[PDB]
Every structure is written in structure tokens, then in C-alpha cells.
Amino acid sequence: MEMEKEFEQIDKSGSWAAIYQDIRHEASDFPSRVAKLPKNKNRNRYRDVSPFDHSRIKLHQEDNDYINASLIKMEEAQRSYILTQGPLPNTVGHFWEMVWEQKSRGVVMLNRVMEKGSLKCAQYWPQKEEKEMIFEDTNLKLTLISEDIKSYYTVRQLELENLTTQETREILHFHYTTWPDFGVPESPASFLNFLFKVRESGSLSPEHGPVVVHCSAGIGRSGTFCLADTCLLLMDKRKDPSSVDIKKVLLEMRKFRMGLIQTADQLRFSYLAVIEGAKFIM
Ligand SMILES: COC[C@H]1N(S(C)(=O)=O)[C@H]2CC[C@]1(O)CC2
């Protein structure tokens, strides 16, 4: 079926939970043996969210190459994304090592450091120009260059230096700051505006490594971001845009990381975002 009318048909019939459970039943199951090794327990935020072995990002280190991060490679859309958990106190150095090694331009952050009164990720970037951060375990230096605070999101320019080689690179930090503590946003307008700002920066384009995107677990809000982006790109590429099937795209993405889209409300919100976004594109 088309999207917008499939949408109204699920609303009127109140069957979002049944649609979402079908997706959960059909989703791929692949091994994640490296994630479950005992030496990696303090590298995982949640025991039930792990990268598959076949798609995990490897750190360029011979001691321990593990990080909780997955490469989502979308062949028809010609887009790639790295989805990862919010960094932990003992993985902030690994996080920036990955950004460096994978040649990423942008980092997309969809959570606040504290939500619901608890810590959802480490304070992994510097908050003042004159107070830079040094990650001694991976030999990197990170400096805040500039910050632009808007009503729904903040954009930061960061300098990452590889202290071994003295090479430097500019990284863009796109921080969506207004996702509610509970539920999903009422309108997708500010989320779509944010997505377009990331696109306009070059961070999603083939001349760079894959964008790094995270929330707390790296599957819920993060899944919504890459699902909406890929669906909108396919609608631009194809002769028949109504042929884009959001449930099929989501199942393809779940071949590369488990659990993408965590609730039926996130599924409905993804439909809403793609539907509204397709009208603005034209
Ligand atoms: C559109 O429905 C939203 C509700 N459904 S429903 C009524 O479709 O089954 C699920 C359970 C509670 C919700 O508010 C979110 C998902």
C-alpha cells in the first residue's frame, strides 16, 4: 500500500502495536559473540543491545578492537551510517578513535547527557574553548572551536588532533536537544529541519566516511533518524515514489543492527516524518 493512506488505515484501526510486533517477529537474528566476551562487559551500556559480529565497527588496535557500534550500509539509497551507543566513561577515547579511523565528518547526538534524572551518556566533548580534552588511552586531543545554540538544536565545530601524527580534522557536532523525556514529538517539523541541516553540511555525503549517530542505546531515536533519511532519498531516486515501503526499509536496516525503532510510537512517528518530509522536498 502507499504510505499516507496505510497510515490513516492503521490510525483508524488502532493497530500500531500489531504492526510493530510483526516487524519484531520478522527481524534478523545474527550472532554477537564478540560483544558478549567477559573482557567487554564495561564497554556495553545495556546487556540486551549489542552489535552483530558481521557488521560491527573494529577499532584499529591489536589489544582489544571492540566498540558497541554497527555499520548500516544501504545499497540502493547509496548511504552509509554508523549507529552507536552513547559513550561511557571508559569508552570516550574509543569513540573518538572510531570517528578518526572511519574518516567521519559529522556526529549526530539525539539525547541529552541527563534525562529522567539519570545519566544517559558521558560528557564526551569540551564545553569551553580554552578547556580542551585529551584522551590518553587513544592519543587524541579535542578542542571546541565554536558553538551555535538554536531553539531545537545546537551545532558545534570541533577540532580533532591525532597526537601521534599531528594531523588535524574539523568535526561537526549536530545535537538535537528537544526530544521529550517520554514519548515522541507531537510534530516532526523540528526533527525534519534538523535532518536537513545535517544534510546541508556535507556530513552524509560520499566524499566523507559514514556519519556517526547515537542516542543512549543507539537503536531508538537513532533508528528513526536513518530510517527517515533513507526513505526520503529513495522517494527522490525512484520513478514511482509511492513504491517506497517503510516497513521493508526498516527490516533491511535491522539486518545490520538489532532493535532499530524501540516502540510503536517511534514507528508511527517515523511514518509521520517521511510523509511530511516528502511534501517539503517538492
Ligand atoms: C496511533 O496509536 C497510538 C497508540 N497505539 S495504537 C492505539 O495504535 O495501538 C500504540 C499504543 C499506545 C499509542 O499511543 C502508541 C502506540
From Swiss-Prot:
Crosslink feature (N,N-(cysteine-1,S-diyl)serine (Cys-Ser)) location: 215-216
Complex formation: Interacts with EPHA3 (phosphorylated); dephosphorylates EPHA3 and may regulate its trafficking and function. Interacts with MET. Interacts with NCK1.
All residue ranges annotated as the Tyrosine-protein phosphatase domain in the record: 3-277
Catalytic activity, as annotated: O-phospho-L-tyrosyl-[protein] + H2O = L-tyrosyl-[protein] + phosphate
Record's protein name: Tyrosine-protein phosphatase non-receptor type 1
Post-translational modification as stated in the protein's UniProt record: Oxidized on Cys-215; the Cys-SOH formed in response to redox signaling reacts with the alpha-amido of the following residue to form a sulfenamide cross-link, triggering a conformational change that inhibits substrate binding and activity. The active site can be restored by reduction. Ser-50 is the major site of phosphorylation as compared to Ser-242 and Ser-243. Activated by phosphorylation at Ser-50.
GO molecular function: cadherin binding; enzyme binding; ephrin receptor binding; insulin receptor binding; non-membrane spanning protein tyrosine phosphatase activity; protein kinase binding; protein phosphatase 2A binding; protein tyrosine phosphatase activity
Effect seen on changing residue 50 to A/D: No phosphorylation
Keyword Membrane: yes
Catalytic machinery residues: 215
Residues that bear Cysteine persulfide: 215
Primary subcellular site in the record, as a coarse category: endoplasmic reticulum
Residues modified to Cysteine sulfenic acid (-SOH): 215
Known tissue expression: Expressed in keratinocytes (at protein level).
Any Gene Ontology biological process: growth hormone receptor signaling pathway via JAK-STAT
Function in brief: Tyrosine-protein phosphatase which acts as a regulator of endoplasmic reticulum unfolded protein response. Mediates dephosphorylation of EIF2AK3/PERK; inactivating the protein kinase activity of EIF2AK3/PERK. May play an important role in CKII- and p60c-src-induced signal transduction cascades. May regulate the EFNA5-EPHA3 signaling pathway which modulates cell reorganization and cell-cell repulsion. May also regulate the hepatocyte growth factor receptor signaling pathway through dephosphorylation of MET.
Annotated residues for binding of substrate: 181, 215-221, 262
